[PDB]
């Protein structure tokens, strides 16, 4: 399992949500953040976290890249982090790699 | 070490906080988030606790029991590896086994 | 690649920002959080994704600029990052082998 962490322009949230939903990726956690790159320096950004299985990573990344890009500086970054265990609170069932 | 990341109902924060504290897990970082899985995005609470490998199951069980309602939307817990843990005050760094 | 996650006192943000910028680490994501250690108080989360060899330099920069010597100075967590993608170009940064 992997956690796909994307930091995008706030106005692109709806595009990213739809591009994900269309491909069958309905689960997500969204956080309001601030940041800067090689560009008051800290500007408003949006963080989208999606936990998926290993094989779905490239599809999720391609969905975010296509829906979040503008071609201008400040489009954002996607970070892929390993997830060793995923637990459903309701049932107590644990998904392990 | 591992980072236990739990996304819970905002009203369950006090239960989770109290449950973790009882078991000796006092250190935690809390973030106000939004999410979906099944208005669109709904208000949720993210609780992050960095613990040693052997304490993971106990931390997960503490969160599961205190955050549960039996209804859909109870939340998820994600376990992430932590390679280095640094205490700012002393500069002391905690590193995982082997090498 | 690694993600350096620092949880600091909110008043130390400008120090940390400057200390990282001086060393060439301009890219960062900041989140307003709450927490406790050894009663949930306002804290600042700073995330910086860097290459493996730059980790120690980044950690030392944060430690020196964020410390006060008093309890509540915070923690730095180092998390592995398998892939880093630039949304604008679609270019992927991975560790060779
Ligand atoms: N190394 C990094 N670590 C953590 N967050 C980062 C990093 N680099 C960028 N970010 C985050 O992604 C957001 C967008 O950064 P972005 O790199 O796209 O800006 P940039 O200066 O215009 O460069 P470019 O589009 O050419 O890569 C930042 O505001 C910040 O929140
Ligand atoms: N795959 C995922 N990646 C990231 N965050 C997720 C994912 N799945 C769920 N979440 C987060 O967890 C919260 C709860 O998700 P969900 O709607 O599936 O309810 P649940 O309690 O996890 O599961 P269930 O519907 O089976 O009871 C969401 O609002 C979202 O913040
Ligand atoms: N184990 C942990 N897991 C997650 N976040 C933590 C953890 N420990 C501390 N934090 C975060 O770092 C912040 C600062 O904690 P800190 O450790 O500096 O306080 P303290 O424990 O009272 O003092 P000290 O570490 O010097 O004994 C907390 O408010 C919380 O947001």
Q: Go through the domains of chain C in sequence order and give each one's CATH number.
A: 1-97 (3.30.70.120)
Q: 3-class SS at B53?
A: helix
| Proximal ligand: closest to the CA of A68 | 1
Structure tokens given for B92: 């002391």
Nearest to C48 by CA among C14, C74, C84, C72: C84
Burial class (CB in 10 A: 0-12, 13-18, 19+), B2: buried
Residues 6+ apart with CB under 8 A from B27: B49, B50, C35, C36, C37, C38, C75
**Ligand 1 binding site (Cβ under 6 Å of any ligand atom):** A 7, 35-39, 45, 73-77; C 27-29, 47-49, 86, 88
Method: X-ray
Residue B18 CB: number of other CB atoms within 10 A? 11
Kindly report the nearest CA distance between residue A22 and chain B, in angstroms.
14
Residue that has been written with the tokens 């029991």 in this structure: B65
A5 touches chain B (CB under 8 A): no
B29 annotated as ligand-binding? yes
Contact A10, A30 (CB under 8 A): no
Contact C83, C92 (CB under 8 A): yes
Q: How far is the CA of A33 from the centre of ligand 3 (A)?
A: 21
Q: 3-class SS at C75?
A: strand
Q: Please give the sequence-ordered ranges of beta strands (E in DSSP) within B14-73, or none if there are none.
A: 28-36, 42-51
Q: Between A2, A57, A77, which is nearest C87 by CB?
A: A77
Q: How far is the CA of C35 from the centre of ligand 3 (A)?
A: 7
Q: What is the phi-psi region of residue A91: left when phi exceeds 0, alpha when psi lies from -120 to 50, beta otherwise?
A: alpha
- Between the two ends of chain B, the Cα-to-Cα distance in Å is 15
Burial class (CB in 10 A: 0-12, 13-18, 19+), B88: buried
């Amino acid at each position: 399992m992997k956690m796909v962490v994307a930091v995008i322009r706030p106005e692109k949230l709806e595009c990213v949500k739809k591009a994900l939903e269309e491909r069958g990726f309905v689960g997500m956690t969204v956080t309001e953040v601030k940041g800067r790159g090689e560009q008051v320096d800290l500007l408003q950004k949006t963080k989208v976290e999606v936990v998926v299985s290993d094989d779905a990573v490239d599809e999720v990344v391609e969905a975010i890249v296509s829906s979040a890009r503008t071609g201008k500086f400040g489009d954002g970054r996607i970070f892929v982090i390993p997830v060793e265990k995923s637990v459903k609170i309701r049932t107590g069932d644990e998904e392990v790699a």
